[PDB]
Amino acid sequence: YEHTAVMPNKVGIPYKALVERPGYAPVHLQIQLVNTRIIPSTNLEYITCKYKTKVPSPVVKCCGATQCTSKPHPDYQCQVFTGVYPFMWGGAYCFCDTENTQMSEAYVERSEECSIDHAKAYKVHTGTVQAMVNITYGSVSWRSADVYVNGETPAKIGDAKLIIGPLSSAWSPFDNKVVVYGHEVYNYDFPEYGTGKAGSFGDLQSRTSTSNDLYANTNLKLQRPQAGIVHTPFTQAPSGFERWKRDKGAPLNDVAPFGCSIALEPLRAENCAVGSIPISIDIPDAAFTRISETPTVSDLECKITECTYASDFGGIATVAYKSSKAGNCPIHSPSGVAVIKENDVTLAESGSFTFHFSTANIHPAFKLQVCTSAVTCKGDCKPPKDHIVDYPAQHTESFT
Amino acid sequence: YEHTAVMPNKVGIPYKALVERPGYAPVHLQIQLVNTRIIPSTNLEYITCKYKTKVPSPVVKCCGATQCTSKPHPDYQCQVFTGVYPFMWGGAYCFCDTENTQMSEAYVERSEECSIDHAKAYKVHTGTVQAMVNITYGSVSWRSADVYVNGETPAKIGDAKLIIGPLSSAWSPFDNKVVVYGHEVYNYDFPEYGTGKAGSFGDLQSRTSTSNDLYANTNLKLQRPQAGIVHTPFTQAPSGFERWKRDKGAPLNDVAPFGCSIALEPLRAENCAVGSIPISIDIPDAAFTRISETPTVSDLECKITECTYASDFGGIATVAYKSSKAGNCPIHSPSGVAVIKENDVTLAESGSFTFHFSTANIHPAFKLQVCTSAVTCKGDCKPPKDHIVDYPAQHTESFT
Amino acid sequence: GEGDTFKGKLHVPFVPVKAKCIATLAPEPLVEHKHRTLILHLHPDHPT
């Protein structure tokens, strides 16, 4: 019952092995993993978005200068201009021609839209892998359940219990530093907190959306007001977040090898096919049947009809059966040379019965486990006509 | 100008460094590390505590058996016993003598004490260390700055600009597995989620205190009531959290080397004195003063009064200054043989002033730099007699 | 009762909390220093 066997780490292809429990009839098994979530641990460094240069109302003293003070606002830029003469719809605003001074100020805050669209930086730890696994055995169920990959945690639905992993490969597609923007993840190297140079990425950085403190190095410098007009013109570098929003590289969900995808989620890289998975399962003894009840099968022989050297189930082979009984009979191929489309077959005395299969080899030489009996299906195959079709399922490519 | 320098990672020591920018008078800088919090990245695994075996009221049928239902409760154990004959304060109450059956059931529930008394498991990543630098340079004499350790985040504190790190040693007292129990942190190896064996640590594991679902492998077992008395005698392993509560090893707070310190916090490791820090600092240009304005102090002479070979400021020495003008001038010994207690000394016209110092060398042959004037205070030192003070105020021992 | 389990969640009157208890304090040790060695005299009243 303690069936321990290693399996490929591939999502679309089941691994229908056959457990040979002594003293009992063999029980067909079938394990397919529909999800291969990585779920790496994350840690937010800072949030980035385009700034807003919020200019306060300027203060104009009609006769006399006024020194400005350094307010604690982030990137609070203040200057005092002199020799002004502001007109403002009701004629000239002050009689003095030289003592009138304007002390404009400006300070940067994160823009209103920063609550919705905002680049997010992260640091990645090792994380914990996870899977959704789909099981059937004997004839008893199509049970499926959510499970961990660490080699200590069991999972149960129905009576069967299993433990899988850990993965043979520690490959994490995410780089050391990653950037998240809405639904696309970029493994961009954000520099550090509080060091973003103006114009480039991270021009404005906040430790969190609610953080009242922030860093904004945007080269904001005030300018003299033009033609005695009451306004606060400021010389400002273009929004750093707007840049790299028009010329961002390819997102990691489009360059990650092994065909992996990400989501607005704990940020797993699902279906990342690499390495192998050491799965182990403890089938419940109730599902077993004593060997003295199942049909034995005798004097059988195998004969293929039309084998196609192809990725899908193109091979068809017929078998002739001298059974002891009527009933079901598990069928499995212990060798990798072929995979069997049909899980199990129904028997009656002296009949002949047909199954579908696929293989990678020009001359398929594989044995058949017809419920505790063997037979060799020798033959030849032919290459298919339609080259590119759907992802392969034969998974046995080797010297030939 | 950009005084790049590596300084040892210690708490109680001034980093008296001179800035010899040509064209202006050299200035001294003092750097001290008040805090050395590490704050490694963490991830909660699960929570353990003593459990409560909540036994519901059993159901007794006076005549006729009752099949039980597999409840979804954690570790729910159900059994039905035959041949029961309960007496309950009014004699017996079932007139049958054999078909009387009691259905008893039990399950494990988190105790109320889990709210305030509960161990915590974590996995540790590298994280990033912070520090509280105290700057005393030129005439500012006071600056409290909290900085990071990455060699990229600047510290534009007041007018001075500072860059610190990255730390030379990645040493972390925390290992991969850490257990937090209220106030003390243990580097115990909790197995994994959902794999706790009964009686050992983590007999029941809960993802969070508010997590409804849990996992409780407690080897719970029911037993038949005896002599016909209505109760649910259940036998189980003693609470695995009570065990190891009296058998926990020495806390990490008292086995961590380098004199680390831990607290109820993001799990920082305060004051782990180890390694050196590549500090690079850009001082403001305003604080510099022209070399041609400071007095010339040539034709000086140095001679010690007494020196002791001690951890304390055991050295007293006098210098025969021969100045031109009168004013303050900072003093420093570039050699690491001795450290000077004084930061700056007022000079009269060819005056003579004392300084205090400490050294680990019996014969200190160290240069003394005094506003661009070198002098060697060759001399001898004397052995101390007491073996009880705090750790040294000099601690730069070398060959002697 | 075979009928049904009624409602009636009953609050637990004395819940456990984290208060401050008065803990003992061991008698002061006698420090006896030597060369590179710390001889510590002890005489507790209870096992510490």
Side-chain angles (χ1 to χ4, degrees):
Chain A
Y1 63 93
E2 183 178 2
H3 178 75
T4 298
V6 66
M7 295 302 185
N9 183 21
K10 295 179 67 167
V11 68
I13 167 169
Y15 315 114
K16 45 179 91 300
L18 179 64
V19 288
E20 40 183 7
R21 251 291 297 276
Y24 291 90
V27 171
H28 184 269
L29 226 179
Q30 183 185 352
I31 159 181
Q32 181 175 358
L33 53 153
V34 79
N35 268 5
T36 322
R37 310 175 192 147
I38 295 296
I39 316 184
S41 300
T42 62
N43 182 24
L44 189 158
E45 284 280 19
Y46 48 89
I47 295 184
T48 303
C49 52
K50 60 151 51 76
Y51 58 65
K52 170 220 285 263
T53 57
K54 180 180 180 181
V55 286
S57 301
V59 255
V60 175
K61 188 171 184 300
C62 270
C63 297
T66 309
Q67 51 186 356
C68 196
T69 172
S70 298
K71 230 165 296 180
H73 286 190
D75 202 351
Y76 175 87
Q77 205 71 235
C78 187
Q79 279 198 16
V80 180
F81 299 96
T82 333
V84 303
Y85 197 74
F87 292 85
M88 184 179 72
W89 75 265
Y93 186 73
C94 304
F95 181 77
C96 285
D97 305 62
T98 174
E99 301 178 356
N100 35 7
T101 55
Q102 175 179 342
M103 33 176 173
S104 53
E105 63 185 61
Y107 65 97
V108 178
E109 64 165 15
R110 57 178 171 274
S111 61
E112 189 177 334
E113 54 273 25
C114 291
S115 56
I116 297 306
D117 58 275
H118 53 280
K120 306 165 60 62
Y122 278 107
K123 181 211 169 189
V124 293
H125 186 196
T126 305
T128 54
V129 198
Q130 199 183 66
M132 183 73 182
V133 182
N134 172 45
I135 289 287
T136 185
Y137 59 100
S139 61
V140 84
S141 192
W142 251 129
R143 160 274 216 223
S144 64
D146 188 317
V147 318
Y148 297 90
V149 107
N150 290 317
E152 294 292 328
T153 300
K156 290 185 176 185
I157 292 188
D159 292 357
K161 176 255 283 179
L162 85 171
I163 50 186
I164 89 178
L167 300 184
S168 56
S169 303
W171 162 265
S172 59
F174 298 89
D175 200 72
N176 189 21
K177 290 183 174 58
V178 295
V179 184
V180 180
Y181 173 64
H183 75 284
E184 296 189 358
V185 179
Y186 307 82
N187 57 338
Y188 182 89
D189 288 64
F190 57 89
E192 182 67 26
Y193 179 66
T195 196
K197 39 188 58 181
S200 61
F201 174 69
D203 190 304
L204 160 60
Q205 306 175 15
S206 300
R207 294 179 66 187
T208 182
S209 293
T210 61
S211 53
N212 63 79
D213 191 18
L214 64 83
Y215 160 97
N217 176 89
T218 179
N219 229 124
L220 176 57
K221 194 174 74 181
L222 302 187
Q223 212 79 6
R224 167 173 283 272
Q226 155 77 2
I229 297 296
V230 179
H231 65 300
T232 303
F234 53 81
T235 294
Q236 169 71 335
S239 301
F241 179 73
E242 178 201 307
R243 188 183 178 182
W244 119 270
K245 192 176 182 186
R246 63 168 53 92
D247 49 325
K248 48 188 174 296
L252 191 60
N253 49 258
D254 290 355
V255 302
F258 314 105
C260 321
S261 55
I262 330 184
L264 203 170
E265 268 204 37
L267 213 63
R268 74 283 205 277
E270 58 190 2
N271 304 17
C272 229
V274 56
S276 59
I277 306 180
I279 57 101
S280 177
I281 179 168
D282 290 359
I283 303 183
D285 300 329
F288 283 95
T289 61
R290 72 187 162 145
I291 190 159
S292 188
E293 288 188 4
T294 48
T296 61
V297 178
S298 303
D299 299 349
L300 72 170
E301 68 189 322
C302 188
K303 171 61 181 303
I304 80 173
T305 61
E306 293 287 351
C307 173
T308 77
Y309 161 33
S311 62
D312 289 325
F313 297 95
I316 43 180
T318 174
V319 171
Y321 305 67
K322 303 305 187 70
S323 71
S324 176
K325 287 287 198 72
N328 286 63
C329 169
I331 188 174
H332 164 80
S333 174
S335 60
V337 163
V339 292
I340 307 173
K341 174 66 173 54
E342 192 163 346
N343 293 333
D344 60 300
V345 60
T346 55
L347 304 184
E349 298 189 39
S350 76
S352 57
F353 316 117
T354 298
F355 70 97
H356 307 264
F357 75 100
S358 62
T359 179
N361 307 112
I362 310 175
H363 304 157
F366 68 99
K367 310 196 69 177
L368 263 178
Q369 296 293 337
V370 176
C371 47
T372 322
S373 62
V375 63
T376 64
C377 302
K378 299 177 58 57
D380 292 66
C381 308
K382 57 221 63 177
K385 300 177 184 180
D386 33 356
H387 13 270
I388 71 175
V389 197
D390 299 359
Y391 233 31
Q394 49 86 342
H395 193 71
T396 190
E397 186 176 33
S398 186
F399 309 118
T400 287
Chain B
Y1 204 171
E2 310 186 5
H3 190 71
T4 76
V6 286
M7 266 79 78
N9 176 264
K10 300 292 300 182
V11 38
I13 171 184
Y15 306 146
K16 297 192 63 57
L18 284 177
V19 183
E20 299 170 17
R21 180 61 188 169
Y24 294 81
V27 65
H28 75 114
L29 269 63
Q30 260 201 358
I31 306 295
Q32 295 177 0
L33 310 181
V34 175
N35 190 321
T36 323
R37 39 202 167 94
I38 285 189
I39 317 181
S41 173
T42 178
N43 186 277
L44 177 58
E45 273 281 3
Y46 55 88
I47 291 180
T48 55
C49 48
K50 187 174 185 299
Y51 60 85
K52 176 61 193 63
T53 124
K54 204 273 188 176
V55 278
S57 299
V59 51
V60 188
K61 289 299 300 294
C62 272
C63 305
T66 300
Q67 296 77 12
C68 185
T69 306
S70 57
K71 299 296 297 301
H73 287 181
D75 201 353
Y76 167 78
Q77 297 300 131
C78 196
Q79 268 190 350
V80 286
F81 305 141
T82 331
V84 197
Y85 197 71
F87 300 81
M88 183 186 170
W89 88 252
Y93 80 158
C94 304
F95 56 72
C96 290
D97 263 326
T98 182
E99 305 199 69
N100 336 3
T101 57
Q102 171 172 344
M103 167 173 146
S104 62
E105 57 178 15
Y107 61 100
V108 176
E109 187 71 14
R110 298 182 298 181
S111 170
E112 302 84 338
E113 307 157 13
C114 303
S115 176
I116 81 284
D117 302 330
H118 58 275
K120 295 177 177 300
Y122 293 113
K123 304 190 96 297
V124 181
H125 189 194
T126 303
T128 166
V129 354
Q130 289 74 8
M132 187 68 62
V133 182
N134 159 41
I135 311 178
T136 303
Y137 90 100
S139 60
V140 182
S141 302
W142 180 66
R143 188 53 52 78
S144 62
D146 47 330
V147 302
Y148 292 79
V149 82
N150 295 115
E152 294 178 343
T153 188
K156 301 176 61 184
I157 321 297
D159 52 354
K161 313 181 188 306
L162 172 63
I163 296 182
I164 159 176
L167 185 52
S168 59
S169 178
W171 168 263
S172 300
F174 303 87
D175 291 331
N176 296 87
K177 304 290 185 181
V178 291
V179 179
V180 170
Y181 171 62
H183 171 258
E184 323 301 329
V185 34
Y186 306 150
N187 58 268
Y188 186 82
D189 299 335
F190 56 96
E192 199 182 325
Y193 178 84
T195 184
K197 292 185 289 284
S200 59
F201 170 73
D203 46 355
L204 71 155
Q205 308 185 6
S206 300
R207 187 53 54 89
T208 55
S209 301
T210 63
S211 177
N212 173 269
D213 306 64
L214 65 150
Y215 152 85
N217 174 253
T218 333
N219 196 40
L220 185 62
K221 253 286 189 172
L222 301 183
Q223 291 186 353
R224 288 193 66 262
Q226 81 297 343
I229 308 181
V230 275
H231 54 11
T232 54
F234 64 99
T235 166
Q236 67 174 184
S239 42
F241 182 73
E242 274 289 345
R243 187 179 178 268
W244 118 274
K245 188 177 182 180
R246 318 169 292 99
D247 212 339
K248 33 77 165 172
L252 188 59
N253 326 26
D254 299 331
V255 301
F258 304 109
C260 289
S261 301
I262 323 177
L264 177 64
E265 255 166 339
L267 299 185
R268 59 184 68 177
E270 296 190 6
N271 306 128
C272 293
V274 53
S276 299
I277 301 179
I279 290 185
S280 175
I281 177 171
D282 308 53
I283 63 172
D285 199 9
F288 265 125
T289 302
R290 298 190 310 276
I291 177 65
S292 60
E293 184 178 355
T294 49
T296 60
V297 293
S298 181
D299 195 5
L300 82 172
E301 178 190 353
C302 187
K303 58 101 177 182
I304 67 172
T305 299
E306 287 199 80
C307 172
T308 66
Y309 171 33
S311 51
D312 192 13
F313 288 108
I316 46 166
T318 52
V319 179
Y321 303 91
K322 279 280 186 176
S323 61
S324 301
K325 313 172 180 181
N328 286 27
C329 148
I331 69 283
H332 161 71
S333 297
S335 180
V337 175
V339 296
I340 309 300
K341 196 178 185 182
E342 277 61 32
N343 295 37
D344 190 307
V345 49
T346 173
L347 299 101
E349 190 170 5
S350 296
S352 59
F353 310 97
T354 304
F355 67 96
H356 292 267
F357 69 100
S358 182
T359 183
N361 201 278
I362 174 179
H363 298 286
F366 66 113
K367 304 181 181 59
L368 172 53
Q369 182 174 359
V370 182
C371 15
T372 70
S373 62
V375 57
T376 301
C377 309
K378 175 180 56 183
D380 52 71
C381 298
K382 184 183 292 176
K385 297 180 180 58
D386 196 2
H387 312 151
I388 344 175
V389 285
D390 62 332
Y391 70 87
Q394 166 261 109
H395 53 280
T396 166
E397 183 270 353
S398 63
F399 270 88
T400 182
Chain C
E2 37 46 89
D4 184 74
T5 159
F6 267 157
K7 299 303 296 179
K9 286 189 171 58
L10 174 48
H11 70 299
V12 196
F14 316 100
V15 295
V17 299
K18 253 190 175 182
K20 299 184 177 300
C21 301
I22 300 181
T24 191
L25 195 54
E28 185 68 22
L30 299 181
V31 179
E32 183 78 359
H33 245 263
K34 286 301 181 61
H35 167 51
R36 267 185 161 86
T37 29
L38 186 267
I39 279 78
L40 194 61
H41 291 294
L42 284 317
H43 30 226
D45 51 356
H46 275 34
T48 148

